[PDB]
Amino acid sequence: GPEKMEVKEIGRSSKIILPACMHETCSGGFSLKNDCWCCLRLKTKQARCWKEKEFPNAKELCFANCPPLE
């Protein structure tokens, strides 16, 4: 047979990502995880970001970041 091109892994949750401008993710139920979203602002890809060390707002938004429900 082939080289097995149909992995499975331990995917037992509702984890998913939300396309837009950056790379974000969210998962609540067992995995409990999420990928930050678009930073402060940029022109080409990098420029102005959010310092979660000084501003807690970025942190809350990062953990709150989740996919659409429509």
26 pairs with which residues across the strands? 16
Query: Are 34 and 27 a contacting pair, CB within 8 Å?
Result: yes
Query: Are 34 and 16 a contacting pair, CB within 8 Å?
Result: no
Helix (H, G, I), strand (E, B) or coil at 12: coil
DSSP state at residue 10: T
Query: Are 48 and 41 a contacting pair, CB within 8 Å?
Result: yes
Q: What determination technique applies here?
A: NMR
18 vs 5, 24, 35, 56, CA distance in Å?
25, 6, 10, 22
Number of domains observed in the structure of the chain: 1
Q: What is the DSSP string of 19-59?
A: -SSS--EEB-SSS-B------SB-SSS-SB---TTT-HHHH
54 vs 1, 10, 12, 41, CA distance in Å?
55, 36, 35, 17
Residue 17 belongs to domain spanning = 1-70
